[PDB]
A paper describes a structure:
However, we were able to solve and refine structures for the apo-proteins which were improvements on previously published data. The available crystal structures for WWP1 (PDB ID: 6J1X20) and WWP2 (PDB ID: 5TJ819) have missing domains and/or high Rfree values. The WWP1-2L34H crystal structure was solved at a resolution of 3.17 Å in the previously unreported space group C2 with two molecules in the asymmetric unit. Interestingly, this is the most complete structure of WWP1 solved to date revealing a structured WW2 domain. The grid boxes to perform the docking simulations were generated in cavities on the HECT domain surrounding the active site cysteines 890 (WWP1) and 838 (WWP2) given the ability of NSC-217913 to interfere with ubiquitination. The ligand poses of compound 11 in both WWP1-2L34H and WWP2-LH are somewhat similar due to the similarities of the proposed binding site between these two enzymes. These poses show the imidazo[4,5-b]pyrazine moiety engaging in π-π interactions with the phenolic side chain of Tyr639WWP1-2L34H and Tyr587WWP2-LH alongside the Cys640WWP1-2L34H and Cys588WWP2-LH backbone amides participating in hydrogen bonding interactions with the imidazole nitrogen. However, the ethyl butyrate thioether chain interactions differ significantly between the two enzymes, most likely associated with the residue mutation at M865/I813. When docked against WWP1-2L34H, the side chain of 11 orients itself so as to interact with the guanidium ion of Arg855, orientating compound 11 in closer contact with Tyr639, allowing π-π interactions with both rings of the imidazo[4,5-b]pyrazine core. As the heterocycle is oriented very similarly in the predicted complexes with both WWP1-2L34H and WWP2-LH, it may be that the increased π-π interactions and ion-dipole interactions between the ester and guanidinium functionalities of 11 docked to WWP1-2L34H provide the additional strength of binding observed in the IC50 values.
Author numbering: 3 to 116, 123 to 163, 167 to 231, 234 to 357, 362 to 548
Amino acid sequence: GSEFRPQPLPPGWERRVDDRRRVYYVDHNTRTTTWQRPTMESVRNFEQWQSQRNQLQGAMQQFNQRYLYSASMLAAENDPYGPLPPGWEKRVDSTDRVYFVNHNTKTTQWEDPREEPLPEGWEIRYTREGVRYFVDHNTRTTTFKDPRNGKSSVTPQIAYERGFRWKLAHFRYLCQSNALPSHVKINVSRQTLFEDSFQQIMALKPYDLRRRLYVIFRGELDYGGLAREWFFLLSHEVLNPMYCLFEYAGKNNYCLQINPASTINPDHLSYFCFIGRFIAMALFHGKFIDTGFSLPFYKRMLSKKLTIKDLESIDTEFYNSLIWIRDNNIEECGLEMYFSVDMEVTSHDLKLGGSNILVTEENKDEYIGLMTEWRFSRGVQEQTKAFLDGFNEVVPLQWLQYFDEKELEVMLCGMQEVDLADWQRNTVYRHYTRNSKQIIWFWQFVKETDNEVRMRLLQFVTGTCRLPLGGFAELMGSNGPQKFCIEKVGKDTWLPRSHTCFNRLDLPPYKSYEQLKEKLLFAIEETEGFG
């Protein structure tokens, strides 16, 4: 009774057997090739992709304006004594270091950081008056007690800021301290970049990817921009449907994820390794990519734990399914769930012997536990390991230790200047009008702040630092087009929530600009979790 009712092959497509009797398919049209039986559906994804990855001619021009980040040596002082207190600059003369305190116009020959380098993870800072304090990125705390001398100054202590500049300058250094000499030659044709890039990288030992990068495109320059270019194109190139590597959670190109069916491709692990070494290489040589993984993917890289609000980002209908079971009686409601999942079709047991354990109130929380874990890692575990190991042999993941996921995404992706007019014209208000005090204040906040907090605000709401390609008018959600939207919720004692799939900032009606600036800034900086 209907053993096979699939689609026929679209004309211009031949099924084949290879030298070992696997089955592959050949788009006679595009003169291309895939392991995965085509539907007339998936071709329009490929067409949705060929349109992306052909029209990206001018995506390049913006993506180089993107090379705003941190004027590397021009703005990265990881001096081991640490910084000069405010108003102090360092100087030299007869090859002898003098110190000027512009704060006072005196001049010492003694460095004011009085000799004993401080432990892994700690940063010295000073204050608008001058007092030295200490920032502990191993716990995101700030005591006044020096880690070495147990010492201090009377106390009235300080709130934690993240120090990205400093966490980055320590990364840059770690990368250049392990860089090898000579160069590694990457030779690719534009028509075959990928197949090409894959084979080369995957034939090198990992250390060689740490030599200088000499990329050249057969038939065409500056070595630097070609490296920018290579990473740009190749980042879009692994996204290509015919390879079966990644799918997407929501419609269009929303919420990129490892496809669990990539196993139809018998080399998929070697590609996740390849893709893995590729992202590491981009970081290690200070080049951006543009593939855009989801924030809970970066969290697995940091090996932080995947909470239930990360689940809201990647499958909004599955997360509502779990919240409902969590906040309502399920003996009251007539369904019959067990500790297993049907997903290709095979029943996998969240727990030992799950498939014959009824989900009762007694254990519905343990169910929601396992359910969340499974959702994040259904069928893509090797794929993930493959990628992480591929990454790890080129940049050891431990070098990422003091980064949160929303920093790890600015290090890969870029950091463009946000167009403030385009943002506010293409913003929609639920339970506000453009004359609402919280809304006027919100854009005063946005004009008044700086670009790094604008990026984090955007990461907090939409889930990504990448502004979409066609203005904020084309910003996308999990159900397709979904403009940035600010919505009045609760009273002034609440905290801002975010709904990443609908690009919705839930913004309580605060009684002042000062309270709003505060309550909000805290929310966009807050990262839960530890790795």
